[PDB]
From Swiss-Prot:
Domain NR LBD: 5-271
Stated role: Nuclear receptor that binds and is activated by variety of endogenous and xenobiotic compounds. Transcription factor that activates the transcription of multiple genes involved in the metabolism and secretion of potentially harmful xenobiotics, drugs and endogenous compounds. Activated by the antibiotic rifampicin and various plant metabolites, such as hyperforin, guggulipid, colupulone, and isoflavones. Response to specific ligands is species-specific. Activated by naturally occurring steroids, such as pregnenolone and progesterone.
Record text on subunit structure and interactions: Heterodimer with RXR. Interacts with NCOA1. Interacts (via domain NR LBD) with CRY1 and CRY2 in a ligand-dependent manner.
Principal subcellular localisation of the protein: nucleus
Species name: Homo sapiens (Human)
Coiled coil regions, renumbered to chain: none
Protein name: Nuclear receptor subfamily 1 group I member 2
């Protein structure tokens, strides 16, 4: 029961997603791997160990490498996985930037607004894409030949990022619903530095209407009552998590540099 413009809208988003989401992570290569003021640190120590994972790498030959991280012993060993996470984030950010560039509504904005929107939403879009490879039964993000597995329970869901992933996964969204979430997040008129606030807001509203209608046309089940509202609440939560993470990143970066050039750009770091 979608309008023609709504169907075109979904088609263009799905097309952009298809072209720019390397769902098997085939082209994620050359990444780093772990080798073989006091209140700033306790805060930084606090920040890091909220998200502890083991790493599995499956070789194209059938071999497997597994990495188990060190327990915290008050040293720099809490940073062993940062170069790898930086490379993965950077790879995801590139996919997200390519996604945005393919979308007509995004291309038509002024270049300063494009930049300001990507700076505001890159993390959120990355998390939305990561949720589609999240396995909520095994606590694992399955990224092709790489897996990231949460280290041992209900105490884990206390970390907001992790609670976000389980709760979003439980809504069992369609591909179309994810890509509309990406759109709504991308076109947020109230990111720092947006000029065409009115244009972006109208665009955002159209993507939300399309999503609301899509759900009304395709999901009659009592289980999906208020689904549209649940999704918008999750987008609000994701914005909050986005802000928290940015501050974490900047604190860690302040005492232990790790951001790649692309990450420096997106998070406003100048090189001076």
């Amino acid at each position: 029961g979608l309008t023609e413009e709504q169907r075109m809208m979904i088609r263009e988003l799905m097309d952009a997603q298809m072209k720019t989401f390397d769902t098997t992570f085939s082209h994620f290569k050359n990444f780093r791997l772990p080798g073989v003021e006091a209140a700033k640190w306790s805060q930084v120590r606090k920040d890091l160990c909220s998200l502890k994972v083991s790493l599995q790498l499956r070789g194209e030959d059938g071999s497997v490498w597994n990495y188990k991280p060190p327990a915290d012993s008050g040293g720099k060993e809490i940073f062993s996985l940062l170069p790898h996470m930086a490379d993965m984030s950077t790879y995801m950010f590139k996919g997200i930037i390519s996604f945005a560039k393919v979308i007509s509504y995004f291309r038509d904005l002024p270049i300063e607004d494009q930049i300001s929107l990507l700076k505001g939403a890159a993390f959120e879009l990355c998390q939305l894409r990561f949720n589609t490879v999240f396995n909520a039964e095994t606590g694992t993000w399955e990224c092709g030949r790489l897996s990231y597995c949460l280290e041992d329970f209900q105490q884990l869901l206390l970390e907001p990022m992790l609670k976000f992933h389980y709760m979003l996964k439980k809504l069992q969204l369609h591909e179309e619903e994810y890509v509309l979430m990406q759109a709504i997040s991308l076109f947020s008129p109230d990111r720092p530095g947006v000029l065409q606030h009115r244009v972006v807001d109208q665009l955002q509203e159209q993507f939300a209407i399309t999503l609301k209608s899509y759900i009304e046309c395709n999901r009659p089940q009592p289980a999906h009552r208020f689904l549209f509202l649940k999704i918008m609440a999750m987008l609000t939560e994701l914005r909050s998590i986005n802000a928290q993470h940015t501050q974490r990143l900047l604190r860690i970066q302040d005492i232990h540099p790790f951001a790649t050039p692309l990450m420096q750009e997106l998070f406003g770091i100048t090189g001076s």
